[model samples]
Target: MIITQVELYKSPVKLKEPFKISLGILTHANNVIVRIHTASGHIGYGECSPFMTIHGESMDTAFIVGQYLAKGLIGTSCLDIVSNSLLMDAIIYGNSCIKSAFNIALYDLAAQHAGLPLYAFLGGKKDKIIQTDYTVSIDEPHKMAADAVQIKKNGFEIIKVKVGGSKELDVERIRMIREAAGDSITLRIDANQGWSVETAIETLTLLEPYNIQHCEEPVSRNLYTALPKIRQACRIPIMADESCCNSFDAERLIQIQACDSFNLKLSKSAGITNALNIIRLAEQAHMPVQVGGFLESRLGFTAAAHVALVSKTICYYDFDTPLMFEADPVRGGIVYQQRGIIEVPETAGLGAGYQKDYLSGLEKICIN
Candidate 1:
């Protein structure tokens, strides 16, 4: 079936608490929603949580591309998603966040037309899903510890600590968090490109006593060549986030022997079609993949959950942004059955639709 119309709209979801990271702090979850209408009378949905720091997209940018992307995509057939993904690139050069929304919308349409839930359409080899990692934003040592403990009590067993501060403070923070959360909670760290090569080495070494599972983007993106040195020097496994965005980047990372793992996000790679290619490259190297994302609500990550089910090599799941939001506008998507554990339904498409009240204030644009 051919796409007949496209709708672009936005809603703002307030974060329960500000999300502090190395890049900056976010008080709101910008929900940029896209709906693709097809001749078969199917309406497919997608959501965008663009990060000004991470994805280099904003609300204004999302608006500018809404009509631009929709127009190019309006007449396309959904029989082949890869061809549609190429059409997305031809319409725009970058702006992955915008492209991501359309990719998701199109996937929903295609999978629904195929009459299978996205997971099965993509190949649901796994019998069950794994628990996701809940991030603890950068904060005071004690506060970070408290947050970790609270998250642990709430049912999440794995905690991804946000650290990108002075060496002394990062050391103090992890120590306190370990003390508060105890030894069982799996701890992962994302420096968000905040540390220097020397600083990352020293701080990671300092924090080794606590048993950090892995550290992400410990140094700047340009400093990725130095990963071998860091990997050689430290006990914790290193993962590449910003440094590995696409297949070529992942190939280079593997060639350099930079990291033990990769953080692959649909938004970062401009959606699943391309991200899957990157994951294949990582698989060649036997590098564990963590399916991650921007600050997306259910629409975005529910799409990811399907990818995760088919992704046999994925060892970690960072699809927890929906938990950080004050309230989710999503319905019929993935659910957290227990702390960190996720459940995917057999509903067609991404298995997600929105609540009217949650989308009451959004500005809508329709294109034919």
Candidate 2:
């Protein structure tokens, strides 16, 4: 279908609590919504949460850059996602957050044109069980443990804890959490690139007795070459988050034996197209992958769930951020069932959009 117009909206939702990570703190899900309309009258929905600390793009940056991206793709064939992706890259350099919004919208349009649900359109099966892990944002050890206790009681089998502060304090955080949450609960930790190589090795080694499921991005992305040393010294499996943003990074990590797994985020990889490529590389390497996100609502997570279904290598899910939102403005998308299970719609395309009233109230710009 020929692309006719594009729409961008600034949709910010308040978080129930400040989501504190090693990188920074976030109070709002400052997300940008995108709608790609075709001459054939099909409109595809997409959204992105621009994390300033990690993605280096704020909500304003995404909204402004989106205009240029939208203008660049106005007359192109929406079905030619590769060419369109290239066109987006040509127009700007490293704003993957906004580029992802367009990429997702194009994929949605293509899937709708095929009359298939997005997962099926991406060659994924319908029978896979998708369960997400809830997170306890970084806080005082006692407060974090309290959150962990509640998370365990909430029927979530897995709980991801934010760490990556002082080595001694991080160990205490895990110790208290494990003590309170009990043994049945699986614990994962994300450092968010907050440690040096020495600190990561020392901290992870100290936290090993707690039986962490894995540790994500123990050190900064700039110190990726040090990952192999950390991975060797620590028993907990190392997952590359900030270290692996795209397929090229994945390939390099594979060659270096950097870490045990890959954490693929649609925003970081510029959406499903590159995400598929990352999975392909991970598959060849026989490395397990996790489908994660940066505080996106159900609209973005629904699309992420489809990408997760596309590969068996994607064995982990971090879809709990949407649950932390004070209000869910999504119209129809993934349903958060009892326990951490997430159910995606069987309808065509993403089967997700914002409530009309919610979108109408947001500041928006349309490019034709």
Candidate 3:
């Protein structure tokens, strides 16, 4: 199917509470939504949530960049996903957050044309159980512990606690969380590049006794060379987030054995086409991966969940962000089952769309 038009919507939704991490705090989900129309009367939907601290992108920038990308792909083939990436790369160097919206829209159309769900169109089976983890944002030790206890009481088996603020405080946070949440709950920590090499080693060693499932991006992405050292010094396995944004970054990390695993986000890889490439690399190297994302509605997370099903190594899911939103504007995508389990959409294409009433209020522009 050939592309006919593209619509870009500036969607900003408030969170139930501010999401705090070591990098920064998020008060709202400043997201962009893309709708691609094709000659065959098929429409594809996609969404992206940009975090200025991490992806170096904001909603305003995505809206501007989205137009340039949409204009460039007006007459291109929707099924030529790789070629679409090349076109986007030619137009902009790195606005993966905005580019991801187009990529997801294209994939949604391609799958609808193929008469299959996005995951099935990508040759993935519904064999694995996709259980997601609820994240506890960074806060005081007692406050974080209280959040952890509530998460546990909410029937979430896994809790991803935000850390890397201070070595002593981080340890105390974990200690309180472990005591309040009990021993059965799996704990994964993400430092979000807030710690130095020495502090990372020290904090991880102290928290090791709490049985952390893994730690993500203990050091800054620039200090990737020191990851192997950090891995050697601590018992907690390291998972790269900011460090492995694309295939090239994945290759470098694998070559040096920098960390134990990877956290793949569509916002980072530009979308499904390149996300699959990174997954292929991880599969070959026998390294596990976690499909993660910023603060996105179910529209974005549903697309990500479809990508996650494409590989068995993507065993972890971070879809809890949708639950954090003040309201869900999506219709028929992913369902949050009991005990952190997730039920992905099985309908053709993304099996999701924004509520019409919700879209009516968003600032939008259409390029034809």
Candidate 4:
């Protein structure tokens, strides 16, 4: 079926508890949602969570990308979603979050039409279940320790703790969490480009004995030169997050022996097509990969799941944003409670449907 029209919605929701990371604190969630309408009366949905500090995409760019991509995708076949995404990339240099939402909606529609789950269509089984990690944002050490205790009590075996403020504080935060979590919980740390090279090496060295599974983006993304030294000094495996954005970054990291693992966020790579390419490169380099998420809606979460299924190089995942949302507008959502593991849905597409009434209650709509 030929695509007919595209709609964009700007949804604003307040978080039950504000979230703080290395970039900034988010009191509310702002997301751009895309709805594609086809000539056959089929409608598909997608979403993007733009972070100015991370990928430099905001709501304004999301709107522009939606409108621009709609003009080019009006008559394109849903079956050719991958190529269409490439065309969008050719015109726009970035905005992967926007293109990813549209790509997912198209693929979802195609999967539904063919009567198969999106994972199966992407060459994975519906029976697969992915293990995900819950994030403990940067906060006071005592408070963060308490939060970690609650997360562990809730059954999350793996916890990702945020660091990067002060070397001593970072050590204290991790140490408190480790003590609270005992030895059963797997702990990972994400610095989010928060530390300097010297401080990163010193801080990670102090915290090494706690058994950190991996340390993500300990220094800056551009500081690949220090990775070898950091890996040599620290006991934990180093995983590159912002450092490995595109295929070029992947190649560079391998050339420099910068990291032992890579983290792939769908929006940061632009879309699934680019993300898949990065995954291939990571495999060639024999680097372990993991799929991460923005503070996204159910749409973005489902899209991430599809990518996670296809890439064999991906071992751990952080696609638990669905559980972070106070109110989700999608039905038959991807399950992400009790610890942080989610089972891939068996139904067609992303195994979720848009809640039009909920969107209506928010009193938001898109125009040409």
Candidate 5:
């Protein structure tokens, strides 16, 4: 099927609560949504959260990427989305989140046209449940502890705690949560590049007795040289989140033995194809890997779900963006249930469909 049109929208949705991480604070959710129309009248939808602090992408960049790609996609076959996306990446240097959203739209359209589910085309494993982690944003020790207790009471088995504001407070927050959780829930920490090498080593060492699963981006991304030293000093497994962006980053990290695990986000690494390459590299290096999210919507979550299902190297899952929003725009949105696990939809193409009325109501921006 030939591509007929492409549309972009910027939707602002409020979060249930303010999300604070090492990067910054988010009170409202703002994302760029893409809708691709095919000659056969099938419209596929995708969404992206442009995190400037993470990969330097924003709503403006998302618009430019969509408009620039629309010209080349007008008469192309949607069936060749994988190859077409590769060409787009070759021409576009940055804006991985934009490209990811566009690629997801094309993939959704292709899957819908074939009358098959997205996982079917991408390699379906037939598993109904996907384990997810609930995020505990950076907060005061008592608040963080209370939040962790509430999350545990809500039946979430895994909690990813955000840290890196102050070393004393960070350690206190984690310790308090560990004490509140009482070995019933697994704990992981993400510092968002908030710690120094010395502080990271000292703090992580103190928390080692809590059975922390892993720590993400404890120090800065380019601190590959200090990773070995830190790993030697701490028992907690170190996972690279912001560090592994593309294949180059993954290769360098592997060569230096920088991290014990990897957190692969589709939008940050370009798309599924590039993400798969990173997973393959991680596998070759015997490193455990997991799929992460960028506070995305249903479209983005669906795309992530498909990738998570087929990922041979994904040991842990963090696709929890859809659950964080106060109101979800897509119908049949994925829900977190029974110990923070999400059931993958059996429907075609990411198992997600947009509300047309909502889309039409949002502001649209188009480029040549």
Candidate 6:
């Protein structure tokens, strides 16, 4: 199946609530979507949500870069998943946002070529239900506690608490969320690289009584040297998010023995192709990996879920972005509930495509 066309789609979505962390607050979800059509009438879809401070990509560049990638892909085989993604890297470096979109589409197309669902194509079982953690974006302690209580009432057992804003208040946030969520509910925290080394140590120590599952990027990725120090001093398992962008970063984090866990996002690692390497490497090193995502729709979230389902090393799941959005423009991929129930599609490939009406209505860029 030769690639016949590549289309870039753009839509600005409003988050249900402002998603705040140490970096800043976001009210809009800038979604960049990709679609590749093959000569055999097969269509592959993918998505990337770029955070300016996190992934460092914007909609314009992701679209422009998609054109460059399309020019080279026009006559390529849909089945050339590995080589195609490698070619995208050779064309440019470090734009994992765009690269991830293309890579996901390529994998989806390849799986369709094989007549297998994405998870099974990646060697995971079909129709498997995945449990995931819902997120409580940073807010006032009482407000966050109220959110946590409602989340628990919604049937979610694990909550990811966004911390790193006003370290003193952050402690209270976790403590209040714990009291609200009850002891049976688990808690994971992400600092979003908002803490200094001293603050990371102090905060982790202060929050230890709450039984946090892990703390993500407590300090800055630039301070890799300090990770070993933080890990030694902190009692909870430390995780690398911004620090472990690609496999190379994963290698370095592993070498230094910096973290006990790694939060691997498809957008961060480029795609399933690169993330697989990170998964195996982390698994071999005896470190657990959590398959997470940016503020994407069901496409990116479910893509990561397929990858997570295939891996034994990924013990944690943060595929709850769909639950965070107020409206969903795409459908038919993975079915989920706010309570953490995940049902992987048994249909061929990613088992989802854009709603034609929605696609026709969106502003777009394309290469034919």
Give one digit per residue, the lDDT tens place, for model 4 in 124-215: 65444588888887999999999898888888888988898999899999888888779767889999999999999899889888889999
For model 6, residues 7-105, the per-residue Cα lDDT tens digits are 998867788888888888888788889999998888899999988898788877777887888888889887888889878888888889888988999
What are the Cα lDDT values of the candidates? 0.85, 0.92, 0.92, 0.80, 0.82, 0.86
Number of clashing pairs per prediction, in order: 0, 0, 0, 2, 0, 0
Question: Candidate 3: minimum summed lDDT over ten consecutive residues — where?
Answer: 311-320
Error of 4 at 49 (Å): 0.5
The 10-residue segment of model 2 with minimum total lDDT is 178-187
Local lDDT at 160 for model 6: 91
Clash count for candidate 2 is 0
Instruction: Write down the RMSD of all candidates, one decimal each.
Output: 1.3, 0.8, 0.8, 1.9, 1.7, 1.4
Q: How accurate locally is residue 37 in candidate 1, as Cα lDDT from 0 to 100?
A: 88
TM-score of 5: 0.95
lDDT agreement of model 6 with the native: 0.86
lDDT of 2 by residue, 6-105 (tens): 9999999999999999988889999999999999899999999999878999999999999999999999999999999999999999999889989999
Tens digits of lDDT, candidate 3, 1-368: 89999989999988988999988888889999999999888899989998898889899999999999999999999999999989999999999999999999899998898889999999998889999999999999999999998898899999999998889999999999999888888889999998999999999999889999899999999999999999888999999999999999999999999999999999999998889999999999999999999987998999988988998888988888999889989989999999989898989999999997788898999999
Model 5 per-residue lDDT tens digits across residues 1-368: 88888888988788998999977999876788888887788888878888888878787777777788777777788889777787786777778888888878888887787788887777768554678888998988899999898888888888999999777888888888888778767888999999999999989988888889999989988776788788888999999888888888899988878889999888877777687788789878888887887878867887787877775667788876677788878876465678877777768776786676888888897533
Please give the distance, in angstroms, between residue 164's alpha carbon in candidate 6 and its true position after superposition: 0.4
- Which residue pairs does candidate 1 place in steric collision? none
